[PDB]
Design a protein around this ligand. Structure first.
Ligand SMILES: c1ccc2[nH]ccc2c1
Ligand SMILES: c1ccc2[nH]ccc2c1
Ligand SMILES: c1ccc2[nH]ccc2c1
Ligand code: FES
Ligand code: FES
Ligand code: FES
Ligand SMILES: [Fe+3]
Ligand SMILES: [Fe+3]
Ligand SMILES: [Fe+3]
Lengths: 440, 165, 165, 165, 440, 440
């Protein structure tokens, strides 16, 4: 079931993404595209679930998703990370109906089958009475998430058991994930819980935005440019870098103009730049020394944001980390799950200041992200009619000017500015490759 | 209390009347220099568990400066989230006035049903919550020292929180 | 005002009580011979633009004769749009009473959330609006001189406007 | 009445405040040993026909013992229908207080809009009805002798009636 | 239209339902399964509509469904039971927009075509003026429900004109329907009207529950075990019987332990056990003498409940009958239509007491059924993702222990306890047989 | 992608629409019929959008639709009428989020691409910085509505670039559109804005109603017959005419009985009947001299109403024009966009009186139309089950009596009465012809 029309327009697009530098618009709001995308992309790719610091002690769990599939992600009583499917083996009831918590066991409400947080079925009510001991428990344990692995805290999951290891899948991106996750000894921490809300926009539009859209800062976030919360210089992204990997990944690094002096590293606490100088490759530190914005997506629907920004119109900027899921609910619907992370050993003052820079700029009520959600939700609206799905998205920025950086000191294909859309094209290319793949 | 009930209740209706009319700057004349406007995050937990409300993280956590930025942003002509403006109705019901921690302060609890609509599409959004305010006296009227909008949702059913509640 | 508040507020609840009970003829004993009951059309426009409300055109623009026809229609036994009748609830909240252009007249503003249901199907409609009335005195109660139901929608989310608001 | 209005109205808000907070046992301290809490069934019938409300059958028909069971059930730690609890908001509007069949009894009519949400899924339920109460006097407050929640629906839009209205 | 994937997983299941004793989980929450189910199951099977006592006098009607199809079920002026489709012959308007009532005629609001409750078009406005008498009325009567028949009060209907008579379809179940419907001279009566409400759960889950799920009483209705409204003995179902028929039907009888003394018959009024002793087969009375719970489903979506239960934590149990429809609204939605029946000639005190035992336990606000609605609605949620639809429902209770009862005195395949799932497996087997049937 | 079952029932219908005089009922509420209808009917036919008087001066625009496709319909700064698609060329954002207004330029909020109301991209932010002047603007202008044309004010639009000119498509109907649109020198005007609301009814039911359904006036608008707002004579339509064209169009003219005296022309102001006597064909004036109601549809979903009616039960009738769109939202949903037009040079008294006759009878809150919306919404409900979609709609009015008028003085196939359904059958015939058309 790829239909004949969708196969043809996916193939035409795969051709145009490298030649014309456009992509077929039919890929944003189609019920058909969405169902194929359920198996082809989300049914194979490595989707993010939780951060290890959400579940520190034994028993702690969070309930997270791959598309419609609900998975308990928890730390079982032996200490290890588990990702159980949240459907009983008996009749398929939710063994856990909270979203967060701490429990040793998971008693299913329907009949009573008790499971350890370890996964294995420990107790069946009326073992002798009903089943006459003829029930073998070991064969009826919570289905393990086919593929489960973490990377420096980030618990990714995959539905395909014959897929690349999470380390191979991230590949050369690991280099850049590190400058964001591996900065301190104690590790990063997710503060509280993610903000979870529903935008009426196709997920790829947010994912597209973070891979390499710094160009948009000036029109859509023009309100913030006027208040002094966004860079006032129309060529602020030109002092930046446009990196991408295979597997659709990609990011973008922006630092300040040559004159403009901003603290080395994002102004991170004295005590953590000392730890980051020795924890990261001597090259990695030099990439991170001048940087002020890092924005990227780890393919499917996870986006990272490390932005140096102000909590209001009267405060000096302070740095914040944010991981966010663009969870796909339907063709024209997503659920943002926006996390906020901070170094554990960072001072409370910085933990508090960094959180208010995130809140007032990004997230549900941010001055930046609320305009992003209005743009995405309107693209999706109009991209849902037949004459519109006929047209094409234009990704021609840099055509006949994009020369890979000879002086770049990190892996992947880099360009020596941030006004480019080679990240977004590559993101869609892998999207399309996975779409057509008759065999994974 | 009485008559302070009549006066706090009519304040909450005038505040709503300003908010549904888009007059956010005029609303900012209410609020106090030590304002705290917070919208907690909620998660499904069992009855047993100590609490529902997430600590350390919030949907919106403003003081007076940050709230002034929020209105400042909307006074600019590039506030796309609201520049063809929403149609909102703040339904302030169940008002319960009770004396404060100090004199001339009152803990003012209301039920809110915010109705949101956005331009010609045939869909609407409904936020339901309970505001727990602290109204100070200032002259012959009141000023808002603090608000906590606790919504009856864990997954928020709007695309953004661009409206003050 | 006071006590005139208590009296106009309980008028608006009694008016709603008559409307949700299907007693439209009894409701028509309220209203004035120079009644004007209007429901303006709204379109999405930008904040800049002068106004939201369409001039020259309306969803409903009744005087007392036309309103009497509207009730007359429903008293007949072939008013299919309401002859298995709707289940409606008029949620009158945020009542703000203020003195009129004349003496014994009051500008009465309420928030309405009309809930509508129609026979066994598992769907409901919700109209949200703000009524701006003009209540005249007549004896020991009031009579309605004018109403302007301004809904929070441009595209109206009901199949028809067969209920008075 | 007056001041008895201010007191019954704030009773109905406190009752709602207890119900949305999950304090059902504390709510049971209200209600009377001859309590009758009934939720009639409705069916679509024509205007002509005598009535809408089904006789002999009900959605919920409690006396004080049966109501105590209902709270007793929720105090146990295996009340799955509410054990990760709902988020509910009881929107009490249109309060109409009127004198009772006896002295110290009052027929208290309110409009309810119950907003219900259940754990992380992006859907909500809304029950709309009109409660007709009978509040007895007991000391310096009131006690509930009877309630009739007449909902504006024939097919009920919630999976169960595990919440008290 | 069965697709290739669904055909294969239906066939794989038909194989597993008797061998592995599991069933594919993809059959609970699939948009594809549901559409096929519309024709295959509900387009052929015998669906319940009304009870004859809802329409006693001439003109009385109720408006009932087979899936999306709306049917007036009434007693025409000649006395007979009619099942008209509720769509005018002219332009297809609802000729009746109430749900209950009494009328002699049905005047269609659009143009005026008046129909008798008999079905035949009696008057066309402007016969001469518009049609010029050239309109033949007899050919334009309300489409009769293809197949219409009642069983001891129960008005079933079917959309397939070439299907087994209702008597043959019920088959050997008639024996057990009798012990519930045929107990008294005057017959059973539906009191008032059914409770009608919307659960967000696939219909089969409720149907699956009543066929033979007494096992669940202890975990899900644990709240009620603590209050003394449910049997406290963890092996209370063991004193029971697990009967099923062909055509997917099946029920379950539970009586009290040998010691525990409960009144003969469910404690039914002196005057009706006298009438039941002579009205039922001498064997049938002996099956009914000790019984305390009878729970079953008459295939598609009708379930019977004859439970001896208390109206509150301080009252002695009294018996109640309940018929209920699990009406299918979509893949993940149903509308419960729960009826309450009582013998006409039963004393008012028992009529009142029986009704309060039904209310406070089952129905919309019951202490029992409100937990059933929470479990079903949660199974459906999680059974709606792709990795979950991959798994299987476990129906292995009794594997290598279920020996048919040689001492059972009634028809069908019986087992000598109630902790079994052979009813549920047979229910799904017929379900699957009907699903694959290229020719009915 | 026109299934095998739908093709067969469409063909069976095309046979029955001229022979049996019925139409298959499966064409009203089918998800499959709707999707095919999106391309086959609305992807080719000429759909109405705006009236030229909605956009008089330069800059004035309205946002209107062909199905799900959103189009800015405006008067560019050169004076001409434009119909741009409302999706940016870059990433496909709404370039305009109002529904009405006046603007010279359309600045896209996402990245900043400014468009003239002329269509052509005038400004790309960071021309040198991002794109390095290598961006050719001329190739990235707002997609013009494939086919755009107005007829005497009526701005129609079509998605098919190889389709008949609008004049040829209207064809012989132009004769009747003229008697409604071309009556005065200054032209017609749309007053204020359309009423826009959502009925839960398939669009074809309203479209079917206006083509030639005067027959319904007596039962559905019986309320209004009792108040003296509708013609009390049961054969009032017999003094009328039943005209239709090719391309599915068709109308219906009713005048008063021979005795009953009503002002010549609909009582239109002295000053515009003077202008209409010379503006219209000497024959057209004689058709319009007696008329009191003109009701028709211009195929797909535009309906005209020129009715002589009262503003209340105590006022003498005054004439009103109304154009309305039955906008298709889904299989069982439409959005009415009901316009009210009046002659510009008509006196203010008549402008005000004509508007109150419209309001109180037609539109959202009318005494007439509110019952129409209840009938359509209930047909759609019941016509959404499988047993109902099996049946057929009856269009047999006049079978063996309809003799074309030899004395009719206007084009198209006319009949000498208004109690007929030959208009509605022709409407559905063209509907079906377009449906099956493998090649347009
Ligand atoms: C600031 C700068 C560049 C960006 N790209 C995505 C978000 C964002 C914020
Ligand atoms: C009591 C005992 C067994 C049962 N099976 C289904 C409901 C029910 C209640
Ligand atoms: C009056 C007479 C005939 C009609 N056909 C459609 C509307 C209408 C109004
Ligand atoms: S489905 Fe989990 S115990 Fe029965
Ligand atoms: S549709 Fe019933 S009379 Fe025409
Ligand atoms: S989407 Fe319009 S400027 Fe980029
Ligand atoms: Fe942004
Ligand atoms: Fe149960
Ligand atoms: Fe009509």
């Amino acid at each position: 079931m790829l239909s004949n029309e969708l196969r043809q327009t996916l193939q035409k697009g795969l051709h145009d993404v490298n030649s014309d530098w456009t992509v077929p618009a039919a890929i944003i709001n189609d019920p058909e595209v969405h169902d194929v995308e359920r198996e082809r992309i989300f049914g194979h790719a490595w989707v993010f679930l939780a951060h290890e610091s959400e579940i520190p002690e034994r028993g702690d769990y969070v309930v997270r998703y791959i598309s419609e599939d609900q998975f308990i992600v928890c730390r079982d009583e032996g200490g290890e990370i588990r990702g159980h499917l949240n459907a009983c083996r008996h009749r398929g009831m939710q063994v856990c109906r909270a979203e967060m918590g701490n429990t040793s066991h998971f008693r299913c409400p329907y009949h009573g089958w008790t499971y350890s947080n370890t996964g294995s079925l420990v107790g069946v009510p009326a073992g002798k009475d009903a089943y006459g001991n003829q029930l073998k428990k070991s064969d009826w344990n919570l289905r393990p998430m086919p593929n489960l692995a973490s990377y420096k805290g980030l618990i990714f999951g995959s539905l395909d058991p014959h897929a690349d290891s999470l380390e191979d899948y991230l590949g050369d991106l690991k280099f850049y994930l590190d400058i964001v996750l591996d900065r301190s000894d104690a590790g990063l921490q997710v503060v509280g819980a993610p903000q979870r809300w529903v935008i009426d926009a196709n997920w790829k539009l947010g994912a597209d935005n973070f891979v390499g859209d710094a160009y948009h800062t000036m029109m859509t976030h023009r309100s913030m440019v006027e208040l002094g919360l966004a860079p006032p210089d129309p060529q602020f992204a030109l002092y930046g870098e446009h990196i991408h990997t295979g597997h659709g990944h990609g990011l973008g690094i922006i630092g300040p103009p040559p004159g403009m002096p901003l603290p080395e590293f994002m102004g991170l606490p004295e005590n953590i730049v000392e730890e980051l100088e020795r924890r990261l490759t001597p090259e990695q530190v030099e990439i991170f020394r001048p940087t002020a914005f890092i924005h990227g997506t780890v393919f499917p629907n996870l986006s990272i944001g490390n932005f140096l920004m102000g909590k209001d119109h009267l405060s000096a900027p302070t740095a914040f980390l944010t991981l966010r899921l663009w969870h796909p609910l339907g063709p024209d619907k997503m659920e943002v799950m926006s996390f906020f992370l901070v170094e554990k050993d960072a001072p409370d003052w910085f933990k508090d200041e960094s959180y208010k820079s995130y809140l007032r700029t990004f997230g549900i009520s941010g001055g930046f992200e609320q305009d992003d959600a209005e743009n995405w939700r309107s693209i999706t609206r109009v991209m849902g009619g037949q004459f519109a799905k006929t047209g094409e998205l234009n990704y021609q920025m840099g055509r006949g000017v994009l020369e890979p950086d000879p002086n770049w000191t990190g892996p992947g294909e880099a360009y020596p500015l941030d006004y480019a859309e080679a990240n977004q094209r590559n993101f869609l290319e892998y999207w399309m490759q996975l779409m057509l793949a008759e065999s994974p | 209390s009485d008559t302070t009930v009549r006066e706090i209740t009519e304040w909450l209706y005038m505040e709503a009347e300003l908010l549904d009319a888009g007059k956010y700057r005029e609303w900012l004349a209410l609020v106090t220099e030590d304002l705290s406007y917070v919208v907690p995050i909620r998660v499904t937990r069992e009855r047993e568990a100590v609490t529902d409300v997430v600590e350390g993280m919030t949907h919106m956590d403003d003081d007076a400066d940050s709230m002034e930025m929020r209105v400042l942003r909307l006074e600019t002509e590039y506030a796309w989230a609201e520049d063809p403006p929403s149609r909102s109705r703040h339904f302030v019901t169940n008002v319960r006035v009770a004396t404060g921690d100090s004199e001339d302060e009152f803990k003012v609890t209301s039920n809110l049903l915010l109705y949101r609509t956005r331009g010609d599409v045939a869909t609407y959004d409904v936020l339901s919550g309970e505001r727990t305010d602290v109204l100070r006296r200032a002259g012959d009227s009141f000023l808002m020292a603090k608000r906590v909008v606790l919504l009856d949702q864990t997954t928020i059913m709007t695309h953004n929180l661009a409206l003050i509640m």
